[PDB]
């Protein structure tokens, strides 16, 4: 048997290899980005946005974020999904973005996911899986984003219910807002301190 | 074969989040322990990237940014295999890399070092591993990079890399070094890894038989990701 | 103090003239043994070079050829001491150096390697040692150089040097390498030297305490020349 | 005690550091060259020229040569000279040249040296000390140049007389010629083979 | 010679600020990492103290506080050299020392140990190093000191010292112990230093050839401070 | 090469060797103290005062402090100062004090320093260098004191600008007050916790 | 996969041409160094031999020359694998072997040793390796052979072999010995190989599990040839 | 990785395994020989012949020789040839012969090869690759045979031009002769001494 290659921080120039346009490097014709909605993509369009804060309460202006999620019917666009259902064919399920160098805001244009089966016949509440990489962070931090308008499903979700300190569950619930007709979910991440966001070892 | 969950990440084989010798980790590390969960479909799936979208020079850092001439520096090929912890090849995984140029200078708005920029070098590439888990790219060997951790901190020459493979749980970012660089024993980021054998797992080896005469040297570097267990009894994933 | 002759050159501490693994030595080595002579004034004298003729950038390979910008590559300072075999400092000796650029390319009409030329790097410098035998110059670390001995021959990164000091008998040309380069163990020119301890005498050491933050690394390299014996009885030189 | 740093060949690009103008590198204001005669230099002007041949009888077109010699009165312009005599003040005593890349010819413009004291009260015949460096040559090869018009002094010279194989002494004698009023001494060096030039360990 | 900055402090050669085994460090250590800066004139200068102000017994702890008789205890001379990390002598540096008496009792309002006070011992001295970096003082060997870290904590016999030298960056306070004291292996303050070789650097050695017959023993203790690098190219300090 | 002698805490009786009068030890005729102003000293007289607080918000009543600063014209009274300017001759530039054992207050009578050249042609804002030693502190803590009435120079200071978390810069700014005609700068130091003072590795 | 050139022959892994202890090499070795060339189509191609032309007993040295009875001597099977230096099998390579009989006598007009000739043994065979690079032949173990190098020279028992494979550059002739023969340490031809590990690479190992009861013993011997590198960037061969 | 099996001399009885008929061993029905021309083979028939000489100027009477060459159109009959052209189907491209035990003469009946592509778009002059094995020879010696009637192509050939000692190029040129209507190329090989044949490391 082999040991996993050890993780190392992505460092402050992680944009060069993962978001070259942000480092002002035009080298690729097709650039991976933060827009998961294609013209024929099914589902309700939503914008996910927030900032990442360090232990002094300041925003990380060099953080890179990625999200992985299911389609509107709760099917992952991956060969590893075993539901035997057809996935939306115009949906990658993944995106990557970086916080703005001046303000630290980040966002994704995506679709609200459908519920996905949990273990042993359970049903998970709708969620987006999210990972954070940045200078100072030695191993990407995994967390999940749930939606405040899914109170009912959240209360029964297996993962949220497996966090024994119940006051911490709320840090994983994003707030729904409606900016000029658009549905926006605000999710701020606090790496350290009061109201520290729950991070998982997955 | 019915796949079950990925084997647990062995936290002792990786750096801790809090590592005071690497100063920026002090305010960017959680104070709470990570909450371990049992895996679901969310953790074992991952996206698929088609080779169709990739340009012909995407894995050629020597030519993909070259305008008026070739970049200045040591021509090297880096190749290897990506496997899971059970030794199975990782097929069609997305590998993205980035690095400084031959002066130890990064092409990034926040890098202001006096080492000279190279108008013909960009410093980023990508490729998909083949069916044997094999990858190969060509580049300029980067120069060691000075930075401010302690004021006179110098990292050894290195290439950053990222992998997106079969399961989200496998998601990984790290970096490799080149055999014999004397700065490897002083790097505070490398020292966040606890064991010596894991520190050596980030060193690419000189591969002399694959050097190309009057052209390029070659380094061999293999990557190991988490692997899935097979299930023969109850399948609890769903 | 009345100086007598230089101590004999120890032929076992140097490469032989005939070394078949270094192919061009086969037709350029004498078949006859060297004829040893007792020294005269001709062998113990040497010319004197005045510092007055040297330009201000003669020991700065980073700037002495720079036109539009700085050369691309690893900024390094090399310094050390030149001493005779009895440990006495060698004062006002002329040190001349030359090397390839960061690509392993030499600025010479007969070098046609594909590694890129650097419009801002020349590759030559010179300096006089001070009264303590000390020397210091700055440069770009050269890249390893491919050549045709066997077709896929690669020399480790190196800087060539030459010394003209107090006595013609001390005349010497050699080259030094940088600590940890893995090509050092395969170089057929380095292998012409018979003993391991003499091979290690050509390796410049990383000098971490002398690195200059956010600027340049530093290597330490000392040179030893033949030394003169002192005479207390008959003085046969003349 | 310390061991001497070991020698290594100068290699084929030795011109870069020692004769930059020959490699087409203009970096220094004052370049060391092959002209030892300054306007006020005393003595008879002579040109020394030849080629260096390898074991196939072919000229080395990448060889670098240096000469060291006394002034017209047999005094070296070095602080190590103990004769208590004043040396010509307009004479360096040293020069460096490289063979032409196409023909292999090399030459020096110099002065004919005066006789220098030998050991134990002897007198050496006039000579120039010469060293050769090139690719293929691991340690510079030292030899001496004597003049054929100094038959008398040559026959009594201590160094020439210390070569026990007497037929080899002639390889160190250069031939005087007179090109259009100039005195030229031709000295060809044969590194290997028949008529191999004597080389010394000094 | 134009001096540049002091070499960086090697944080691995010193105790960390947070060392839970030394209990009072828990609330008196910063939570944030230190911010490293590039040096300016403020960091490379320091005050000058004139020997003129020093009394004749300032380095004689045996007599400088003696009123009715001599202090009780082991008469010892301590001497050594203060050098910078490049081996250069530290000239005219101010050395201040303080210690407990032969009972392990300090002359301080906050020390209430039952070990007896000595009416003829004060416990403080000072001196300036000479041009060779040499210092010498005489005293009573202190007794081991009990204190409350864990309730039965005992420190080995030691003398505290302080140095103010050429640059503010060199500012240092530490303490030395005496060869062979068995308490050295149990001291939690000594254990805050990470490496064994640095822990041994605080041990003064018995110097038998310098004992003075029927009078005093002698200990040898050398101190090393940070050293400045010399500059040969750009001088950025100002 | 040699390694620096490792640091060790000064401990609670550091007054014995450094401020003997405070430990009630009269042994020296000339005692180093906290008064940097001599009768002929040039510049505006100021008092610098504050307390040092531990992680519980309590004052260290055993802390020893030293300051190093330039004269009124920004010249250090040290042979290492390279400005080529004459320094005030009646100014040591350094002082030492200890906090009061009962209240923890400390103070210095000094002069306001002039601006000192920074690196590469810059100008630093007026500042005093300060170091703290005490039981519990394993290595003296270096910090700097800037003045709130030098807003303009502070905003352009190279060191303050090199602290990337900008909210922390304010911990190094002392507040000007005017006690009965005297100018007083209050500078409290917080070793741990909220508003922790910036400490440097110099 | 686009193949590039064969990896360079490592001259240090083979005997030199001039080896004075093997006397006939003195006048049959070039005085000039070999001239290394970059490979072309001429060096990477080789002929193809069809199995169709081979007789059924071509790899059976025990029966292919037998007339009135079986040859006298030790019945042995030799088998193994032929691979390139990257471990890939060498398919359909022509292997030709020849050897002395059980007396150490060769069936050749120039061999006049008193060891007896065997009317039923010829001493030559051939075979093509299969798709796994496997070969197998049967024979009589040869006896050690006396010869005149020094007058009492004896070579250990051995079988000569030749390989013609995929590229002309791979062309090779050598010989293997049998495990434990005491003459292996004295053979001057074996001593022309410089390193001990390469000398051991010519020793066939006893393969006890493959012995055939009451019939034949078995030896295992693997052969490694030069291997081609794969090309992923410019293909300069043509 | 593995190291190449080391070479060893073929020895004086190399005929037993490689040319059994020459050792008077009839064991095989099909014997490999020195005749590369089959009845339908295309191209001009030529005979290649010579002797191999040792350092005393004497012929090796136990040497074995093999040649490898392209067909009349410069295509190799090997699966490794990448020209995408059809090769003559009645041509093996290889032969083996041994020198006569009494005279040392060797020969091959073959076809004159066509030009083969060189590296990077060049064209090589017609040549035959040849290897020599014999007692005294520890590693087979590779050389090439060019034709004197191809002066034009020889002058531009990449391999011949890569031999820097130009006088040695002529040792690789065989001489055309016409014996009673047959075209014969004489190529003598001199292993050591004056006019030593160039040998390659391929
Ligand atoms: Fe980096
Ligand atoms: Fe070189
Ligand atoms: Fe104490
Ligand atoms: Fe044999």
Short mmCIF file of C-alpha atoms in Angstrom, two decimals, chain G residues 61 65 118 120 158 206:
data_model
loop_
_atom_site.label_atom_id
_atom_site.label_comp_id
_atom_site.label_asym_id
_atom_site.label_seq_id
_atom_site.Cartn_x
_atom_site.Cartn_y
_atom_site.Cartn_z
CA UNK G 61 21.21 -28.86 -28.68
CA UNK G 65 23.13 -33.03 -33.98
CA UNK G 118 31.36 -35.87 -28.92
CA UNK G 120 26.50 -36.52 -31.15
CA UNK G 158 29.78 -20.77 -20.48
CA UNK G 206 19.91 -22.57 -10.64
#
